[PDB]
Amino acid sequence: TIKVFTTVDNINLHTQVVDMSMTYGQQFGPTYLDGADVTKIKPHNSHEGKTFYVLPNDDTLRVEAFEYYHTTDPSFLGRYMSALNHTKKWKYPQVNGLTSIKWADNNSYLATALLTLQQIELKFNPPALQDAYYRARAGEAANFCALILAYCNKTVGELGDVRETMSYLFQHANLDSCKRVLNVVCKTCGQQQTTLKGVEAVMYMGTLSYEQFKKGVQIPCTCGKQATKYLVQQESPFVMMSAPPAQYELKHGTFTCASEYTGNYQCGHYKHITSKETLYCIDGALLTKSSEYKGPITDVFYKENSYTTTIK
Ligand SMILES: COCCn1c2c([n+](Cc3cnccn3)c1C)C(=O)c1ccccc1C2=O
Ligand SMILES: COCCn1c2c([n+](Cc3cnccn3)c1C)C(=O)c1ccccc1C2=O
Ligand SMILES: Cn1c(=O)c2c(ncn2C)n(C)c1=O
Ligand SMILES: [Zn+2]
């Protein structure tokens, strides 16, 4: 017999008396010690007093996991631990002032997402995610990346999509005050306003150019004609404009940052472009400075506070 603590969040610890003859799995279920899976292992005397992670297998643990991670998915903790085993071994160099990720396990979409998150104003709601985010900002990004994978249902090594990653993350962010008002104008059907809130207020698919969005983009109408959709009002600290990858040029001073994608879904690679005093292409640990940039851009991020159209 030894005494240990079990936990699902490393915040609320639960005393346990362990029997030395059974494995950890037989008496607790799947169990982790400092990230290492110990389910199959017999207890050691040197384990006394240590903290073990277990799966949320009763109502106290389920509620604690829910409050810390904001999910009820039973597989969450295990997928997070599997990911964390790998992400603790990645390297997080500081590149042009931001925490990046040295390439490994097809992780360029995560590097681009992490770099983007450090340049827009955002607050995550789950305590685990926001805590890991602040550590990632300071340079210890392993937990944040493992959590990103867990929330997106991705495993280490899988190819990822930045727009989809951002959408999952934004679902967990406090964007409830973000508002977008759009107008669609058809010569036959007339005008129709729409109001969008939260994630849908800050994300748009179809054009990369915020300016074009404000002037109007051509979209189809059911009446057979082409209508014009334009941005009437925007309240948010940033917006994200996406479109299928295509040759596009980024002008210094007109955007905050952007994602470039080369390849397809079987095989590809993201790079990150940011606008500072001049343009920088952060490519994992690699850094290239240039005054112009052209490439297959797929997402562009813009600062915003409050915008109202002057179209009549
Ligand atoms: C932070 O405010 C945002 C409002 N909110 C909260 C949640 N969810 C979504 C959700 C996601 N996965 C499963 C079920 N529900 C929203 C939209 C929680 O999960 C939650 C859990 C424990 C204490 C507080 C909260 C909480 O506040
Ligand atoms: C023009 O097709 C629009 C839909 N789409 C997209 C993709 N593909 C496959 C493909 C195959 N060969 C070359 C290029 N793309 C299609 C058909 C992406 O791989 C992709 C990767 C990263 C961000 C967005 C996208 C994206 O939107
Ligand atoms: C620049 N680059 C890469 O660096 C890369 C890649 N696939 C894997 N890597 C690492 N592709 C398609 C690529 O264009
Ligand atoms: Zn019409």
Author numbering: 4 to 315
The publication says:
Proteolytic processing is achieved by two cysteine proteases, the papain-like protease (PLpro) and the main protease (Mpro, also known as 3CLpro). PLpro is responsible for releasing Nsp1-Nsp3 from the N-terminus of this polyprotein by recognizing the consensus sequence, LXGG. Additionally, PLpro catalyzes deubiquitination and removal of interferon stimulating gene product 15 (ISG15) from host proteins, thereby interfering with the host innate immune response. The PLpro monomer consists of an independent N-terminal ubiquitin-like (Ubl) domain (residue 1–61) and a catalytic region with a right-handed thumb–palm–fingers architecture.
